[PDB]
Amino acid sequence: QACYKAAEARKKGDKDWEKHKIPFIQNTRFTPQMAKDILAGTLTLEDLVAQGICEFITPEEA
Amino acid sequence: LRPQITYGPIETVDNEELTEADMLSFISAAVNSTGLIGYNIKSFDDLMDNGIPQIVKQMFNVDITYKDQRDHTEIDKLRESVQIQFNFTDVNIERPQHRNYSQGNKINLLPNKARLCGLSYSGPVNLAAEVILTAHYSNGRQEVKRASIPPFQVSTFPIMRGSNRCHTHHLSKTAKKEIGEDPN
Amino acid sequence: TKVLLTEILLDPMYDYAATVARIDGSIPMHKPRTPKEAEYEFKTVIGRTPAELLSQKEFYDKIYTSKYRPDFTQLTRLRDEEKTSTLIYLRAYELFLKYLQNAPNFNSELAEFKTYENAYGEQKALLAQQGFYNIFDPNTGRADQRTRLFEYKRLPISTLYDERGLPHKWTIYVYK
Amino acid sequence: MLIPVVCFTCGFPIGTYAAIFDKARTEYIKTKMGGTLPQNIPLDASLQIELKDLITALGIPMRVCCRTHLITTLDYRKYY
Amino acid sequence: MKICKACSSCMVRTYVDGNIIFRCSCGESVQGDSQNLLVSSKVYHTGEMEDKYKIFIKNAPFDPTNCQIKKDCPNCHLDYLTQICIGSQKIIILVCRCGYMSNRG
Ligand SMILES: [Zn+2]
Ligand SMILES: [Zn+2]
Numbered sequence: 001q002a003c004y005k006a007a008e009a010r011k012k013g014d015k016d017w018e019k020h021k022i023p024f025i026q027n028t029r030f031t032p033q034m035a036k037d038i039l040a041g042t043l044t045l046e047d048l049v050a051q052g053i054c055e056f057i058t059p060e061e062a
Numbered sequence: 063l064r065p066q067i068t069y070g071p072i073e074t075v076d077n078e079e080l081t082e083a084d085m086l087s088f089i090s091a092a093v094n095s096t097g098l099i100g101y102n103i104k105s106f107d108d109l110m111d112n113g114i115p116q117i118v119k120q121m122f123n124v125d126i127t128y129k130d131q132r133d134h135t136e137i138d139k140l141r142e143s144v145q146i147q148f149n150f151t152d153v154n155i156e157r158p159q160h161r162n163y164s165q166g167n168k169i170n171l172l173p174n175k176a177r178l179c180g181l182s183y184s185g186p187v188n189l190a191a192e193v194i195l196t197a198h199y200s201n202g203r204q205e206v207k208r209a210s211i212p213p214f215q216v217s218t219f220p221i222m223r224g225s226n227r228c229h230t231h232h233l234s235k236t237a238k239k240e241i242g243e244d245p246n
Numbered sequence: 247t248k249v250l251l252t253e254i255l256l257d258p259m260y261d262y263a264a265t266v267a268r269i270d271g272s273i274p275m276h277k278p279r280t281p282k283e284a285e286y287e288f289k290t291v292i293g294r295t296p297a298e299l300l301s302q303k304e305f306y307d308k309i310y311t312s313k314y315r316p317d318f319t320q321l322t323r324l325r326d327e328e329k330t331s332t333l334i335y336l337r338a339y340e341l342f343l344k345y346l347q348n349a350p351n352f353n354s355e356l357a358e359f360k361t362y363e364n365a366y367g368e369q370k371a372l373l374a375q376q377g378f379y380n381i382f383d384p385n386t387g388r389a390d391q392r393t394r395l396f397e398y399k400r401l402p403i404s405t406l407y408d409e410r411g412l413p414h415k416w417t418i419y420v421y422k
Numbered sequence: 423m424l425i426p427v428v429c430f431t432c433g434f435p436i437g438t439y440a441a442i443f444d445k446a447r448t449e450y451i452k453t454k455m456g457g458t459l460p461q462n463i464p465l466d467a468s469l470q471i472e473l474k475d476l477i478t479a480l481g482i483p484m485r486v487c488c489r490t491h492l493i494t495t496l497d498y499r500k501y502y
Numbered sequence: 503m504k505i506c507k508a509c510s511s512c513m514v515r516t517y518v519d520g521n522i523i524f525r526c527s528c529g530e531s532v533q534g535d536s537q538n539l540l541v542s543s544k545v546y547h548t549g550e551m552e553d554k555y556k557i558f559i560k561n562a563p564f565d566p567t568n569c570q571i572k573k574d575c576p577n578c579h580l581d582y583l584t585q586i587c588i589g590s591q592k593i594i595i596l597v598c599r600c601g602y603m604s605n606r607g
């Protein structure tokens with residue numbers, strides 16, 4: 001969406017069309033606190049799957 | 063259906079402190095979910111509770127016909143074939159048993175006794191059935207005889223150690239240790 | 247008599263009951279050396295004479311039952327740790343005997359004692375720890391992530407070609 | 423099945439301090455363990471458990487072999 | 503083939519005095535006019551023709567396992583494209599989720 005808004009601003013003759021872009025961000029939701037909860041036993045793989053943090057992958061889905 | 067859940071924005075997740083030693087915990091979690099060989103026990107338990115009963119009650123319906131090869135001997139000339147038809151209705155598998163001395167009452171059999179005595183860690187298989195015999199006559203009529211059988215033990219099925227039908231499944235780790243089993 | 251004795255002396259249940267009988271002194275701490283000692287140990291552990299065992303049809307009803315009946319309701323977590331080990335041992339034997347006898351209301355007690363013994367095994371796992379260390383990065387305060395791995399970087403094209411476009415051939419060694 | 427009576431390499435009498443070094447070690451770990459299940463201690467990635475001064479307080483010298491065999495030997499009582 | 507108008511069967515093709523005659527097993531016979539003058543054919547390099555990769559090339563911008571390139575899409579002005587390399591001549595095609603496709607397709 002930010003790419004379209006930046007392009008839209010450029011076609012409008014604006015000089016600062018580049019300031020409408022945002023950086024790309026990709027990350028996993030696994031946190032250092034989740035690692036500590038695993039070692040305390042209060043976080044299992046079942047509720048890591050239930051919270052949408054990890055999922056099971058089969059060689060054909062891979 | 064469309065997915066309705068939403069997660070917090072990925073731009074606010076704080077993972078800059080994550081070390082590759084912290085990720086090992088994830089592996090730990092995985093190994094704690096499946097155990098190490100948990101699939102073997104689960105598969106054998108599925109075969110015990112659901113597999114063999116389904117196979118016996120569904121895929122082993124017998125319906126055969128045979129020539130009547132008798133002699134004159136009254137109406138036997140007028141009957142040509144007999145139709146044997148039966149199926150099994152009840153199926154179950156129990157825990158391994160052994161008979162103490164002779165004419166005993168089938169006490170339990172622990173795995174260590176089976177290992178030492180060269181025995182078979184096999185639990186009894188009990189079946190029940192209903193049978194229908196049809197006799198076909200030359201003129202065109204037929205006669206049907208139906209019987210129902212009380213449950214009886216056909217044989218013994220091998221039991222995987224540590225599974226549901228194992229005696230070392232109702233025992234604690236100390237009790238497992240003290241009956242000669244590897245507690246770990 | 248001989249076949250019954252040979253069958254039962256190889257039963258793990260027999261050695262477990264004999265251990266429980268030895269713990270509280272009901273039978274001598276050594277193995278039988280004479281026929282009389284073996285017959286006495288069998289009578290005490292199995293609870294029936296070998297000749298009388300054939301006579302009937304029960305077997306598990308009278309197997310030894312430990313003398314001291316501690317209170318296993320302190321196994322509800324509530325000179326305690328050695329007492330805890332003693333209670334775990336005695337409760338395990340008592341539940342083993344209950345399972346053999348198909349005593350009513352056993353599965354719930356079995357799961358309860360399974361939870362108790364899982365806690366006890368957690369304590370033993372604490373006892374079985376050699377220690378562990380992590381080499382920390384002084385700049386950070388956690389496990390070292392510094393590595394000598396390869397790190398890609400687009401070099402200038404002048405590192406391969408000259409201002410006339412020809413490739414470099416590093417073949418003259420200069421010694422000072 | 424136990425910490426050896428003597429060092430496997432040089433033969434210094436490690437065993438005479440083994441039992442003590444057992445108990446003390448556990449106590450020391452109980453101080454540093456921290457909100458983590460026992461069986462997860464070798465996975466914590468934040469632990470700094472060092473037994474150097476504990477072994478030194480026993481009088482055991484600074485020999486690599488002796489401290490190696492004292493620290494690393496498995497105990498059969500703790501796995502059975 | 504030729505399909506019999508009576509029994510919808512596959513007729514057999516024969517050649518008589520310079521004409522194609524389709525004769526069925528039910529006795530019905532017809533003669534093809536123009537569309538039946540194709541005795542045989544073959545097409546080469548079937549594993550790299552444009553007709554093979556139509557679905558893949560259409561789906562390429564949406565497959566997350568495809569290589570991306572930092573190059574502006576000239577249509578929607580998105581700053582990245584999906585690059586694919588098909589064939590033994592290594593033909594490079596840049597595609598976008600908006601429908602843009604280098605090589606004009
Ligand atoms: Zn040494
Ligand atoms: Zn036709």
Ligand SMILES: [Zn+2]
Nearest residue numbers: 575578598600
């Ligand atoms: Zn586009």
